[PDB]
Amino acid sequence: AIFDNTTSLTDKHLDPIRENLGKHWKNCARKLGFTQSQIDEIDHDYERDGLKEKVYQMLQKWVMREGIKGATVGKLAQALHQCSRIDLLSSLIYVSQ
Numbered sequence: 001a002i003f004d005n006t007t008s009l010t011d012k013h014l015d016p017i018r019e020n021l022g023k024h025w026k027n028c029a030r031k032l033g034f035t036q037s038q039i040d041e042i043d044h045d046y047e048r049d050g051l052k053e054k055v056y057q058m059l060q061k062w063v064m065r066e067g068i069k070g071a072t073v074g075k076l077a078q079a080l081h082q083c084s085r086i087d088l089l090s091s092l093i094y095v096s097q
């Protein structure tokens, strides 16, 4: 079951989220525990780099903050549930097999 999966996230799990989180990324950032101030910093600091880079930076900051113990398949699954991205949750289930 995806929500109890304790596997540490690596590129293979993160890549579908990097590619598809898309323009509606900030609500998922809040569910991943970023404050509005932190979201604003990412939004401003990576404006010239583009939306995909804002997404990349947000996800990587989360993986770095939570570490190997905390940045897991099951925790990402819960975040995707909480931010209502069942499309992304489905891609995560498939890549985790």
Ligand SMILES: *[C@@H]1O[C@H](CO)[C@@H](O)[C@H](O)[C@H]1NC(C)=O
Pocket: 030, 034, 035, 036, 037
């Ligand atoms: C926390 O998230 C809520 C939405 O759930 C938002 O209204 C509020 O502004 C956020 N606060 C901060 C400090 O990010």
